C-alpha cells in the first residue's frame, strides 16, 4: 500500500462526470470539478483541466494525470501550511498518508482547522486523536472512509485497507 493505492481505493475511478458524496460534479479519481450546480460549468472546468474539448468523458490516462496532480497538490498544501507542516513532519510514513488522504478529501484549510485533533496527533496520543477525529461532520457524512483513515492514524498500519 501507498498513498496512491489508498486514495484510489477511497475515491474509485469513473471516466464520466458524476456527483460526489456532497452532490458536487467530479470525475476520475475524486477530482472535484466545481461546487457549482451547473453541469455546463463543470464541463468547462473539465476542458480547462484536461486541455481539450471533452464530452464530459476522459480516458483512464487523463484521470491518472489529474490524480497525480491532485496528490502532489495535497502534499504541497500540507507543506506550505503552518498548522499542517509540523504535524506532517512529526508523523511516520503511514500516518503521513492518512493526513494526505484527509487533505485530498476536504482541502488544506479544512484539515488545518482540526486544531485539537492535530495537537493529539503531534503528541502521538493515537487513541485520543482517533476519538476526537470522529467528532466531526467529516466522520458523520463519510463514516466508512473516515473509519479507515482514523484506523490508519490509530495503528500506523494499513490494516483498514488490506482486505479490500
When CB distances are held under 5 to 8 angstroms depending on the partner's kind, the choice from Cl ion, K ion, none that residue 132 binds is Cl ion
Q: Of 11, 45, 62, 108, which residue is the catalytic one? A: 11
- What is the distance between the alpha carbons of residues 40 and 131, in angstroms, rounded to a whole number? 41
Told to judge if 47 belongs to the known catalytic residues of this protein, a careful annotator would answer: no
Which residue is it, cell 463519510? Answer: 142
Q: How far is the CB of 18 from K ion (least distance, A)?
A: 8
When CB distances are held under 5 to 8 angstroms depending on the partner's kind, the choice from Cl ion, K ion, none that residue 40 binds is none
Which residue is it, cell 453541469? Answer: 39
Candidate list 3, 6, 11, 74; residue touching K ion; CB under 5 A: 11
User: With left for phi above 0 and alpha for psi between -120 and 50, is residue 107 left, alpha or beta?
Assistant: left
**Residue set of the binding site for substrate:** 32, 104, 117, 132
Nearer to Cl ion, 88 or 117 (CB): 117
Amino acid at each position: 500500500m501507498n498513498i496512491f493505492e489508498m486514495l484510489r481505493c477511497d475515491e474509485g475511478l469513473r471516466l464520466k462526470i458524476y456527483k460526489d458524496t456532497e452532490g458536487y460534479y467530479t470525475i476520475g479519481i475524486g477530482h472535484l470539478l466545481t461546487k457549482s450546480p451547473s453541469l455546463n460549468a463543470a464541463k468547462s472546468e473539465l476542458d480547462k483541466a484536461i486541455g481539450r474539448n471533452t464530452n464530459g468523458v476522459i480516458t483512464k490516462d487523463e484521470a491518472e494525470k489529474l490524480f497525480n496532480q491532485d496528490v502532489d497538490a495535497a502534499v504541497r498544501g500540507i507543506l506550505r501550511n503552518a498548522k499542517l507542516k509540523p504535524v506532517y513532519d512529526s508523523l511516520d510514513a503511514v500516518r503521513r498518508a492518512a493526513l494526505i488522504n484527509m487533505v485530498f478529501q476536504m482541502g488544506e484549510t479544512g484539515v488545518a482547522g482540526f486544531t485539537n485533533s492535530l495537537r493529539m496527533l503531534q503528541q502521538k496520543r493515537w487513541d485520543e486523536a482517533a476519538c476526537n477525529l470522529a467528532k466531526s461532520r467529516w466522520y458523520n457524512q463519510t463514516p466508512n472512509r473516515a473509519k479507515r483513515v482514523i484506523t490508519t492514524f490509530r495503528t500506523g498500519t494499513w490494516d483498514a485497507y488490506k482486505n479490500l
